[PDB]
RNA sequence: CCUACUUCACAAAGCGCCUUCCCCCGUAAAUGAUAUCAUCUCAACUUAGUAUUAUACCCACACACCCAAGAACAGGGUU
RNA sequence: ACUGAACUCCUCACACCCAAUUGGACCAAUCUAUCACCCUAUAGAAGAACUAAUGUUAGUAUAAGUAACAUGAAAACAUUCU
């Protein structure tokens, strides 16, 4: 589910992604928006890329990192599977999500006057 | 422009032992089965063509003791004639060279 | 350096201490002058402290040449087949008693770099750590995202 | 002696043999060619309707050489004849393993002797029925234009007025220095220059200290592929198999092109009409005539035009 | 680039070139058998073959004796061409001539050739032979051919 | 069990071999003379009963090893790893001779032996195989033959492509495995001791036996696998470059027993033919 | 790229001929709260508004001679 | 909160981290005295120690098997031809 990361703040338009063709203007920055869009794994393989240690491991752990955009993962893979780790950000719920009982629960903060719009 | 630094033995051996400058193996080399000699497949056996020259130069020592002398060139054919051999019926009306040694096995 | 240089891993020669401690020393040769001021306090040695060490030391037997070749010397021959040679030119009395000393307490095993300061066979008693250590299962050993 | 020898199939075979092998494999050759001229009663795959964003095989044809050609109006085209030699659909590949989004067909032509192709490319082609041919193609298509492989192409597969992409190597002109391969302005002839006439001015600046990689610089030229877009077809001979393509194609005589229906936006749903998966003689639906002709070209034999 | 270029470019230039070629030729016309660098007989073969040509056009024709004249450099050669070689290849149309390589030189290494006009008096070079139709190879193919031919 | 015989068969082999390697003690210098056109004149003393004419061979040059299959010692065809006996004069047959006749029979031998112990050794256990005979055909004929009587088990079951070309892998396992072709002069009382079990062989034996003067045969090992031999055979069997055991032929007329006729077809390293044609001697083989 | 023309001539060239395909964003609007009007909105939201270049190109594991391939090597052809 | 030095503590040991300069303890090899007579000792001496002077001489590398150089042709090796 790569593709459905989450960027706080505005980085999904302020944060840009760098590169060099090598060639004279060849110069390509590009917003996470249109990183994402053109390469759906694109954004956590160069996070996770970026925090490895620069040295000759990286790319042999990086062999070791498989992404996929979606819930479908190969069969041979899943197999492989021992272990799921937390997630490290607890989605906040929606109040589509919220059962009538939780909110009964909460409090009524204030009386709003009945003569009003709304 | 001069060398900017000395190559080292390492790096020169990189270099001159690279396939690229080993020399290669020929593959088609072979045995003429005549004489049995070596010869390349497309190439004339060495040995054979020795004897056809060393017996080409003889027949033309003969040639030009005929002739004797420069722009003597015949306007007939020629045959060349061995120890116990007689011009044949179509041998007739060409130059015959004589050699003292007996007729090559081939030369037919 | 430790690069340039052969290590090995902290150990004794047959389990020296488990039973019993065996004196890996075995064999003491001095080859010492009767002339010659190099071999003086091998000669003093020989004269004053190698009866009392070899009294104090009686699994080590102890050779007296008194003809040396090219330097008085002590060679310590020790149980693991190990050969040290020591020269002792020039060295006083109280030198060469503690460089004899030293011979006797020593092992026969190569003075190189000892890669650990320490040699266990039993190192976990507990279970050496591996993945699974700590890792809690589940029903029927499903992994994870697995439909049955 | 090491066992390595390079053999050919010729080195063992006597006077006699010689003969009798050419000629048994060229009949076997022809025999195979001619099993495949009638593909619509072998089993032929489903023929699907042209629908907007089809995109249907390309041929392999020969670049026979090139001839004037005139118009209505009065203009003078230089077109270009392209033979479809022995073509053939060889393979079929879809599109989750056509290493993209899109269906491919292989196509071949120019039967070659199989006296000198590899092993693998022997047995493929025998698996297939087929003489080798010189040179594959990849052609990417919709599913629609699926053509069973050993199927024959002919030119007739393109018709006249519609436009075409013909793709082939460039003739190779080796090693060529600057200014002829990039139009360098080079130097002067005369006013004292010494031993710079042809050669690379600068070729970067005094601060990067190096060469940005795309630099032009000497080096070979030619022998690569390039595709004209856009060529009309003007005339199709269907006794010869032959192509007139308008203007210059890539590549010298008797080189093969790649030829596909053009990619540009302006000929995108020209197809309609076109015989959708290719043209198919053993259908039979109408014999065409010995040349097909575009509506401007001036055919000859007709009477002299007069501009009235 | 020289694409369909078809002449060698040999000696000094043009000229130099041609008179090598003569040289070559003359040789060739005289001895019957000549040894020379491999492309200079390669480049020699088609020139002595038109020259049999211009033999077998006759003696009597203008322009085949002055092409003689020309390309024979010792002219006792030219009865010689026109009475000897062309009445000996009358019969034939063409492949007068027979190059095959030969050991590379001692001297240079070079790439070495000869070029005999067939039918001379001179030895027969050893010429390569195919292998004979009695090989294992030879007979299954030999069967091959007798049972296309009974069944077809 | 099949493996025990070929265990004591082997053993009898190796019995016979040294029984005559006794019979033959010492070293007895027999002068053998190559009257071969090239190199003639020259002269190999050589060890009587204990060299061979790979050794004289081995003597001339490492090309006449390797292209030459067979010996005419005195004017008779030789194998090149069978012993020689007298002071004789000895010619190497190639493949590439004038007339390599006896080659080509020789070689159309040992490939028909070849494809003898792939077929014994093919079938599964329970199945019993009879090797008959290696019937004696023309090279014309475009395929070598080995006749086998397979159970009545499968006298119903003709080989599948697929069983052909495991028969064909296991002939390249053999050829890869480059086994001599080992060779005996032994009479006919030892060959018939060998192959008491086999009828055919047995019967086979008494012919030859019969044909010959004396009851001496021709009998041949690869590798655990011994059988007589119409004449010599080659002397290795990387020899063979291309192979296939192409068909399988059930000989018409069979009221007793079903002889099968195993068809295939090879040519060596020497003459090695190009992928088409191959194919096409292929397709000519299955008849 | 060579059919013509021209330099030329079994071919290379231009002075000759042939082909060349989507955009980028500054603003202008719709509904609408904070601030019940209004308000294009670093409010939620709806358009102009699109790069997520679209494609096309290339894709066959395994002597000698000739070549439009080529410095060598490599490449293609030899039915 | 933790991390964090050659700081400090800890076990053991301590003369053992500046340029110029200065003080000092040792010392390779050589020769001499006298020893030792084995390859050393105590002394007296001195052409008494070389990773560095575009150092001197010699050797051999690198550049590099590179730049460069050379034989008109055939032939009967007589000769002929260009
Ligand atoms: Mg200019
Ligand atoms: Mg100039
Ligand atoms: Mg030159
Ligand atoms: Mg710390
Ligand atoms: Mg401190
Ligand atoms: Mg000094
Ligand atoms: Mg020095
Ligand atoms: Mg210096
Ligand atoms: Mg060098
Ligand atoms: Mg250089
Ligand atoms: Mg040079
Ligand atoms: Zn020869």
């Given at each position: 589910?790569?593709?459905?990361?989450?960027?706080?703040?505005?980085?999904?338009?302020?944060?840009?992604?760098?590169?060099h063709t090598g060639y004279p203007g060849g110069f390509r920055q590009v917003t996470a928006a249109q990183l994402h869009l053109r390469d759906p794994v694109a954004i956590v393989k160069l996070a996770?890329?970026?925090?490895?240690?620069?040295?000759?491991?990286?790319?042999?752990?990086?062999?070791?990192?498989?992404?996929?955009?979606?819930?479908?993962?190969?069969?041979?893979?899943?197999?492989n599977l021992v272990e799921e780790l937390p997630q490290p950000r607890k989605i906040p719920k929606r109040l589509d999500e919220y059962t009538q009982e939780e909110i009964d629960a909460f409090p009524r903060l204030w009386t709003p006057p009945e003569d009003y719009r709304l | 422009a001069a060398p900017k630094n000395r190559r080292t033995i390492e790096v020169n051996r990189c270099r001159r032992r690279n396939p690229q400058k080993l020399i290669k193996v020929k593959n088609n080399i072979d045995v003429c089965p005549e004489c049995g000699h070596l010869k390349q497949k497309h190439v004339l056996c060495a040995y054979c063509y020795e004897k056809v020259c060393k017996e080409t130069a003889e027949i033309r020592r003969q040639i030009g003791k005929q002739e004797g002398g420069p722009f003597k060139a015949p306007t007939i054919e020629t045959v060349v004639l061995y120890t116990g051999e007689t011009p044949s019926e179509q041998d007739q009306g060409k130059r015959i060279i004589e050699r003292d040694r007996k007729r090559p096995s081939w030369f037919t | 350096t430790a690069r340039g240089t052969p290590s090995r891993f902290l150990a004794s020669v047959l389990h020296n201490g488990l039973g019993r401690y065996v004196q890996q020393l075995q064999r003491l040769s001095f080859s010492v002058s009767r002339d010659g001021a190099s071999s003086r306090g091998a000669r003093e040695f020989v004269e004053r402290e190698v009866i009392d060490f070899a009294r104090r030391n009686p699994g080590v037997v102890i050779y007296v040449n008194s003809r040396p070749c090219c330097v008085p010397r002590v060679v310590a021959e020790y149980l693991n087949g190990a050969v040290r040679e020591e020269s002792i030119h020039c060295k006083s009395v109280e030198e060469i008693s503690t460089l004899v000393q030293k011979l006797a307490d020593q092992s026969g095993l190569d003075?190189?770099?000892?890669?650990?300061?320490?040699?266990?066979?039993?190192?976990?008693?507990?279970?050496?750590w591996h993945p699974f250590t700590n890792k809690p299962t589940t029903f029927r050993g499903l992994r994870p995202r697995e439909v049955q | 002696l090491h066992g390595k020898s390079g053999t050919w199939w010729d080195e063992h075979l006597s006077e006699e043999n010689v003969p009798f092998i050419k000629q048994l494999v060229s009949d076997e050759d022809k025999a195979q060619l001619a099993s495949k001229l009638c593909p619509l009663k072998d089993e032929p795959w489903p023929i699907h309707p042209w629908e907007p964003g089809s995109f249907r095989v390309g041929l392999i044809a020969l670049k026979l050489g090139m001839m004037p050609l005139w118009t209505?109006?009065?203009?003078?085209?230089?077109?270009?004849?392209?033979?479809?030699?022995?073509?053939?659909?060889?393979?079929?590949?879809?599109?989750?393993?056509?290493?993209?989004?899109?269906?491919?067909?292989?196509?071949?032509?120019?039967t070659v002797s199989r006296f000198r192709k590899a092993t693998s490319i022997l047995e493929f082609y025998r698996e297939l029925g087929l003489p080798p041919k010189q040179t594959v193609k990849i052609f990417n298509i919709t599913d629609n234009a699926a053509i069973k492989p050993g199927t024959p192409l002919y030119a007739a597969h393109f018709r006249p007025g519609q436009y075409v992409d013909v793709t082939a190597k460039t003739i190779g002109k080796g090693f060529q220095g600057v200014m002829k391969r990039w139009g360098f302005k080079g130097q002067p002839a005369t006013h004292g220059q010494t031993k710079t006439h042809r050669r690379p001015g600068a070729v970067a600046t005094g601060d990067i200290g190096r060469v940005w990689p795309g630099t032009k610089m000497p080096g070979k030229m030619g022998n690569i592929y390039r595709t004209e877009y856009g060529l009309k077809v003007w005339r199709i001979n269907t006794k010869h198999n032959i192509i007139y393509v308008n203007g210059?194609?890539?590549?010298?005589?008797?080189?093969?092109?790649?030829?596909?229906?053009?990619?540009?936006?302006?000929?995108?749903?020209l197809g309609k009409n076109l015989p959708f998966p290719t043209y198919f003689p053993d259908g039979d639906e109408e014999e065409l005539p010995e040349d097909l002709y575009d509506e401007n070209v001036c055919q000859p034999g007709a009477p002299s035009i007069t501009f009235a | 680039i020289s694409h369909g270029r078809v002449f060698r470019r040999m000696g000094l230039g043009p000229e130099s070139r041609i008179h090598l070629l003569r040289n070559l030729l003359t040789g060739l016309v005289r001895h019957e058998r000549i040894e020379a660098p491999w492309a200079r007989v390669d480049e020699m073969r088609g020139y002595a073959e038109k020259l049999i040509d211009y033999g077998k056009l006759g003696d009597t024709n203008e322009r085949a004796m002055r092409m003689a004249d020309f390309w024979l450099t010792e002219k006792d050669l030219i009865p010689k061409l026109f009475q000897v070689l062309a009445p000996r290849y009358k019969d034939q149309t063409?492949?007068?001539?027979?190059?095959?390589?030969?050991?590379?030189?001692?001297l240079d290494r070079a790439k070495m050739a000869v070029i005999e006009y067939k039918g001379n008096c001179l030895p027969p070079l050893p010429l390569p032979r195919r292998d004979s139709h009695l090989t294992l190879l030879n007979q299954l193919l030999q069967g091959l051919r007798q049972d296309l031919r009974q069944s077809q | 069990s099949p493996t025990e015989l070929t265990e004591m068969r082997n053993d009898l082999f190796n019995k016979e071999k040294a029984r005559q390697l006794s019979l033959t003690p010492r070293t007895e210098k027999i002068e053998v003379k190559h009257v071969g056109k090239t190199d003639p004149g020259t002269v190999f003393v050589m060890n009587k009963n204990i060299s061979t004419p790979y050794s004289c061979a081995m003597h001339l040059s490492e090309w006449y090893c390797r292209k030459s299959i067979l010996a005419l010692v005195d004017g008779q065809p030789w194998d090149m790893y069978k012993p020689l006996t007298k002071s004789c004069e000895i010619k190497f047959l190639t493949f590439k001779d004038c007339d390599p006749g006896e080659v080509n029979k020789a070689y159309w031998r040992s490939c028909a032996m070849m494809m003898g112990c792939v077929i014994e050794r093919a079938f599964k256990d329970e199945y019993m195989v009879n090797l008959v005979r290696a019937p004696e055909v023309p090279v014309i004929s475009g395929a070598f033959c080995y006749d086998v009587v397979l159970d009545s088990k499968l006298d119903e079951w003709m080989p599948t492509k697929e069983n052909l070309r495991s028969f064909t892998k296991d002939a390249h396992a053999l050829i890869y495995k480059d086994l001599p072709f080992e060779?005996?002069?032994?009479?006919?009382?030892?060959?018939?001791?060998?192959?008491?079990?086999?009828?055919?062989?047995?019967?086979?034996?008494?012919?030859?036996?019969?044909?010959?003067?004396?009851?001496?045969?021709?009998?041949?090992?690869?590798?655990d696998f011994i059988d007589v031999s119409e004449g010599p055979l080659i002397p290795r069997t990387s020899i063979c470059f291309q192979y296939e055991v192409s068909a399988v032929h059930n000989l018409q007329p069979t009221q007793p027993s079903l002889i099968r006729r195993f068809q295939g077809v090879s040519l060596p390293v020497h003459l090695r033919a190009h992928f088409t044609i191959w194919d096409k001697l292929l397709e000519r083989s299955r008849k």
């Open positions: 589910n790569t593709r459905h990361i989450a960027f706080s703040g505005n980085k999904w338009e302020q944060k840009v992604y760098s590169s996770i890329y970026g925090m490895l240690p620069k040295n000759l491991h990286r790319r042999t752990m990086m062999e070791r990192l498989h992404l996929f955009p979606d819930e479908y993962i190969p069969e041979d893979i899943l197999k | - | 003075v190189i770099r000892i890669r650990k300061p320490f040699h266990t066979d039993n190192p976990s008693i507990q279970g050496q | 209505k109006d009065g203009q003078k085209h230089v077109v270009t004849l392209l033979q479809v030699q022995d073509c053939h659909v060889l393979k079929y590949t879809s599109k989750e393993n056509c290493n993209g989004k899109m269906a491919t067909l292989s196509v071949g032509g120019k210059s194609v890539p590549g010298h005589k008797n080189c093969l092109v790649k030829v596909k229906d053009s990619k540009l936006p302006a000929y995108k749903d | 063409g492949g007068y001539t027979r190059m095959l390589q030969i050991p590379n030189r001692s | 060779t005996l002069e032994v009479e006919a009382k030892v060959a018939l001791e060998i192959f008491q079990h086999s009828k055919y062989k047995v019967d086979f034996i008494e012919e030859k036996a019969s044909q010959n003067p004396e009851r001496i045969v021709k009998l041949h090992r690869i590798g």
